[PDB]
Design a binder for this molecule. Structure first.
Ligand code: HEM
Ligand SMILES: O=C1N[C@@H](Cc2ccc(O)c(Br)c2)C(=O)N[C@H]1Cc1ccc(O)cc1
Length: 393
């Protein structure tokens, strides 16, 4: 037999039994990735947290030439260090402030957009596709608003994402074509006097402030492309797979419909059980480090399996059940942990909370319109998502 291959399954509606078996028997284990490289797969909560909290397991160094790779880069190697570059430029605080869900009227815009999308699906009649005609457009509209760019430019930027977030064994020619085009777009945005709000409006002002005169135009444009792409793919894919988990739990769907004040706690549990990340989070050891029973050596690749941690019964008893009264509800790893913890975590929560609130009000009887096994799971991608999510109500 050949060495165990990752990823185990592209399905986002069920966790393979192999995960709990590995976690119990071999919570750090050698595997082979799609590139042919070997890596250490970490699958318990305790070891996942250890890796993510030790900066000697480096994100930036995953991009080094000659390193064992989870997958091929779809961005320039410097962009793997995006958050470090933002910090070095003195821009971290300003970026964080621009992506909070607390801007005036942002939540009202999200509710208005979600309700408009749902009204259009109702008018058209069932079946409706909740990914392509709800979750993704809501994510795209949110990110255009947060960035300050025209809503009408969302669709073209969005069309780059089915390639940009591929998890490929080899470089992707289309990823470069789309990247260069999207960078050119954001560079034009920085020069566009109509763009005065949101993240791009703020970056456009900082760009002309003397305290930032030597920050490169490349970085300013890159911030726009990366925050659009990462935010849209992550929120769209999370909401889509959360809606599946909700539809498959009619008792919970009815509880949240009747008591919407529980939606935040329900979204936190949906984050915990979410299988949206298709691969473990990659890190390269910069030193020899003991992790459980394995001495990881300098230069080796480690993969932090989020669902390994989030379904670990030693941390979350009865892990496959959504329970709204856990004592450790936000201690999941859905947004990562440590140096690279997701900077858009609050916006991602609010996107999902508002999307679910609106859906349950407009379509309280929402149900799958096809048997669940008929969903088509995207392969070789950095997220797990169904190509279409057909529902009736
Ligand atoms: C539910 C939605 C979201 C989920 C589940 C999610 C998940 C994650 C995870 C797990 C990481 C850690 C990656 C790693 O450590 O290797 C991360 C990082 C990141 N996320 Fe999110 N995310 C979401 C929403 C967003 C949003 C809305 C934005 C921006 C608008 C965003 C931007 C980023 C960026 C830029 C990073 C990289 C941070 C860094 O390298 O230090 N995410 N996200
Ligand atoms: O900001 C970043 N940090 C790192 C780490 C990272 C990688 C994949 C993700 O899913 C997440 Br989330 C984080 C990076 O390599 N790239 C960007 C995200 C990004 C944006 C647009 C793209 O086309 C491709 C990647």
């Amino acid at each position: 037999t050949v060495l165990l291959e990752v990823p185990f399954s592209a399905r986002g509606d069920r966790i393979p039994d192999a995960v709990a078996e590995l976690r119990t028997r071999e919570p750090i284990r050698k595997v082979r990735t799609i590139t042919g490289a070997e890596a250490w797969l970490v699958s318990s909560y305790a070891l996942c947290t250890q890796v993510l909290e030790d900066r000697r397991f480096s994100m930036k160094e995953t991009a080094a030439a000659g390193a064992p790779r989870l997958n091929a880069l779809t961005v320039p190697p410097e962009v793997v260090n995006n958050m470090g570059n933002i910090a070095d430029a003195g821009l971290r605080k300003a970026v964080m402030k621009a992506i909070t869900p607390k801007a005036p009227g942002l939540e009202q815009f999200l509710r208005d957009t979600a309700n408009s999308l749902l009204d259009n699906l109702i008018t058209e009649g069932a079946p409706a596709d909740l990914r392509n005609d709800f979750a993704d457009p809501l994510a795209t509209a949110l990110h255009c608003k947060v960035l300050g760019i025209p809503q009408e430019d969302g669709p073209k930027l969005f069309r780059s994402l089915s390639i940009a977030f591929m998890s490929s064994a080899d470089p992707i020619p289309a990823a470069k074509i789309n990247w260069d085009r999207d960078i050119e777009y954001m560079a034009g945005i920085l020069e566009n006097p109509n763009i005065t709000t949101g993240l791009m409006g703020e970056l456009s002002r900082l760009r002309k402030d003397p305290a930032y005169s030597h920050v490169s135009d490349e970085l300013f444009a890159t911030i726009g492309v990366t925050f659009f792409g990462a935010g849209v793919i992550s929120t769209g894919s999370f909401l889509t797979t959360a809606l599946i988990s909700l539809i498959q739990r009619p008792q919970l769907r009815n509880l949240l419909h009747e008591k919407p004040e529980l939606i935040p706690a329900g979204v936190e549990e949906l984050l915990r059980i979410n299988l949206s990340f298709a691969d473990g989070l990659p890190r390269l050891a910069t030193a020899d480090i003991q992790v459980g029973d394995v001495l990881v050596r300098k230069g080796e690749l480690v993969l932090v399996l989020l669902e390994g941690a989030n379904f670990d019964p030693e941390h979350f008893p009865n892990p496959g059940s959504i329970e709204l009264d856990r004592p450790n509800p936000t201690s999941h790893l859905a947004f990562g942990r440590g140096q690279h913890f997701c900077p858009g975590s609050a916006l991602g929560r609010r996107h999902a909370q508002i999307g679910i609130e609106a859906l349950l009000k407009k379509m309280p009887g929402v149900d799958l319109a096809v048997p669940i096994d008929q969903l088509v799971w995207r392969t070789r991608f950095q997220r797990r998502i169904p190509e279409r999510l057909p529902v009736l109500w």
